[PDB]
Amino acid sequence: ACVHHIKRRDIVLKWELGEGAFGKVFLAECHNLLPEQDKMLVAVKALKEASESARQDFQREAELLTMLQHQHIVRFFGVCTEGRPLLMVFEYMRHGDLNRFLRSHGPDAAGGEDVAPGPLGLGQLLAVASQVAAGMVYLAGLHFVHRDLATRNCLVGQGLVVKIGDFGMSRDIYSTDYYRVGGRTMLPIRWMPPESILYRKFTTESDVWSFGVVLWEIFTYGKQPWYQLSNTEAIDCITQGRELERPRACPPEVYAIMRGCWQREPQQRHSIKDVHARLQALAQAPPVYLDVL
Ligand SMILES: Cc1cccn2c(NC(=O)CN3C(=O)CSc4ccccc43)c(-c3ccccc3)nc12
Numbered sequence: 673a674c675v676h677h678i679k680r681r682d683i684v685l686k687w688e689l690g691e692g693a694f695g696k697v698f699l700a701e702c703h704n705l706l707p708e709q710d711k712m713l714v715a716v717k718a719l720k721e722a723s724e725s726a727r728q729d730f731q732r733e734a735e736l737l738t739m740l741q742h743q744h745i746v747r748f749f750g751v752c753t754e755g756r757p758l759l760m761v762f763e764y765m766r767h768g769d770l771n772r773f774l775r776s777h778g779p780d781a782a783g784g785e786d787v788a789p790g791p792l793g794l795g796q797l798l799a800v801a802s803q804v805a806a807g808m809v810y811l812a813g814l815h816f817v818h819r820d821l822a823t824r825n826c827l828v829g830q831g832l833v834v835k836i837g838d839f840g841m842s843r844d845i846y847s848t849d850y851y852r853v854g855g856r857t858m859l860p861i862r863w864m865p866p867e868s869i870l871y872r873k874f875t876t877e878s879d880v881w882s883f884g885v886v887l888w889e890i891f892t893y894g895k896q897p898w899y900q901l902s903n904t905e906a907i908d909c910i911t912q913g914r915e916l917e918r919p920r921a922c923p924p925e926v927y928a929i930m931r932g933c934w935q936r937e938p939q940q941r942h943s944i945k946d947v948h949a950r951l952q953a954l955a956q957a958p959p960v961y962l963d964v965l
Contacts, residue, residue, distance in 0.1 A: 673731075673734075673735075674735065674738050674739075675731075675734045675735060675738050675750060675751050676738070676749060676750030676751070677750055677751060677752070677753065677754075678702065678705065678749065678750050678751070678752050678759075678761055679752070679754060680752050680754050680755060680759075681703075682702055682703040682704055682705070683700050683701070683702055683703075683714075683716060683752060683759065683761070684700055684701045684703075685698045685699075685700050685716065686698065686699045686700060686701065687699055689715060690839065690841055690845065691841070691844070692720075692839070692840065692841025692843070692844040692845070693720070693841075693843070693844055694719065694720055694721070694726075694840055694841070695717050695718055695719050695720050695839070695840070695841070696717070696718050696720070697715050697716065697717050697718075697839045697841070698715070698716045698718065699713060699714075699715060699716075699764060700713070700714050700715070700716045700761075701713065701714075702714045702749070702761060705749060705761075713764040714749060714761050714762060714763065714764055715761075715762045715763070715764045715765070715839070716752075716759050716760070716761055716762075717759065717760040717762070717839050717840075718757040718758070718759055719756075719757055719758045719759075719760075720757075722756050722757065722758060727758065730751075730758055730760075733760070733840075734750075734751050734760065737760070738750075739814075740810075740811070740814075740816070742806075742807060742810040743806065743833075743835075744803050744804070744806040744807030744810065744834065744835050744836060745807050745810065745811075745835055745836055745837060746762055746763060746765065746827055746835045746836065746837025746838075747762065747763035747835075748760070748761070748762055749761040749762065749763070762837070762839075763829070763835075764829075765827035765828055765829040765833075765835065766828075766829055766830055767786070767827075767828035767829065767832075768827065768828065769823065769824050769825070769826060769827055769828075769838070770800070770804075770823040770824070770826035770827065770828055770834060770890075770894075771822070771823040771824040771846070771889070771894045772894070773828045773894075774792075774823055774889065774890065774893045774894030775893060775894040777791060777792045777893065778791060778893035778894070779791045779893060779920075779921070786830065786831060786832050787832065791893065791921070792893070794921070794923070794962050794965065795955070795959075795962060796832065797890055797891055797921065798926075798951055798954045798955040798962075799832065799955045800832070800834050800890055801886070801887050801890050801926075801951045801955070802948065802951040802952045802954075802955040803833070803834035803835070804826055804834055804836065804883065804886055804890075805883065805944060805947050805948035805951050805952075806948055806952075807835060807836035808821070808836070808879060808880070808883050808944045808947075808948070809944050809945055809948045811836070811879070812876050812879065812943075812944045812945075815876070817874050817875060817876065817878070817879055818836070818879050818882065819874050819878070819879075820838075820842065820860050820863070820882075821836070821863065821879055821882035821883055821886060822842070822846075822849060822860060822863050822882070822885070822886060822889070823886060823889045823890065823894055824838070824842050824845070824846045824849060825837070825838040825842055826886075843858045848896070849862065849863075849896065851903040851907070860882075861903060861906055861907055861910070862885065862896065862897040862898050862906055862910075863881075863882045863885045863886075863897065864878065864881070864882070864910070865877070865878050865881035865882075865910075865934075865938070866910060866911050866913075866936060867938060868881075869907055869910060869911055870911055875938060876944070877938035877939070877941050878938075879944070880933045880941045880942065880943070880944050880947065881933055881934060881941060883933055883944065883947065884929070884930045884931075884932070884933025884934050885897050885916070885933075887926070887929060887930050887933070887951075888916050888919060888922075888930055891919040891921050891922035891926065892919040892920075892921075893921070895919075897916055898910075898916070913936060915931065915934055916930075918930075923965035925954065925965050926951075926954070926965075929942075929947055929950050929951065932946070932947065933947065
């Protein structure tokens with residue numbers, strides 16, 4: 673345990689945000705967590721069970737999350753292990769998951785504090801993609817493999833800060849984004865490359881394939897990839913080499929980055945470093961450049 677511990681009394685649950693098979697997520701006040709703030713909001717994941725399996729899991733997940741600290745990874749603050757339920761404390765991200773954020777700022781579009789009215793602009797869509805790519809750079813740096821990279825598994829906070837992370841309930845909230853195979857096995861097939869579906873191999877390079885599909889989601893304002901297709905039809909068309917078609921809002925410049933992630937041969941896919949650098953440069957480009965993309 674390099675894991676930070678937080679006393680139960682410093683956490684006051686306000687209400688539920690979300691619910692899964694393995695736990696609930698609450699919004700809470702946390703006291704004496706940061707210097708500038710004696711009181712701040714957090715999201716708290718409470719473990720449903722607390723058995724031999726659940727608690728050695730929990731202890732591992734706590735170690736991994738303590739190790740992943742970066743500007744575009746959901747901030748993990750620590751655990752509360754003084755009397756059940758066991759709690760994991762996280763930064764509260766007020767716009768929820770990126771898929772929901774994308775859908776509620778789509779081409780059919782309520783502007784507010786963080787976002788213009790209307791559909792998100794090119795500038796905004798690129799700044800989102802760029803942030804997700806920044807988190808994928810940091811994970812690949814540590815040779816960590818995600819395996820479920822999707823907009824649903826990103827969050828959005830104040831200022832449209834976008835960070836990779838979920839509460840491990842995406843299977844329950846987004847059951848349609850998964851193919852159920854086993855009795856309890858659920859594969860994000862629409863996000864997976866041919867080597868992951870055929871050979872069951874998962875690598876850095878299946879993560880960049882999955883990021884290319886995140887980039888497609890972003891530029892379709894959260895549409896499900898292959899939504900027109902069933903699970904079996906999507907497997908067929910992915911293993912047979914069919915590529916998702918350019919989203920309306922996606923400049924050719926950007927459709928090419930998407931295609932660099934989707935080379936059939938893993939070693940041919942561009943590196944995440946290269947993709948970040950392309951999206952950041954676009955995101956930071958002056959309006960005069962962007963207006964003619
Ligand atoms: C049960 C399960 C299945 C699939 C993904 N699961 C995750 N999710 C991740 O591990 C996803 N994830 C990265 O894989 C690393 S980035 C990152 C940041 C913050 C949070 C998560 C992250 C969990 C889970 C557990 C405790 C707390 C939170 C999440 N359980 C699951």
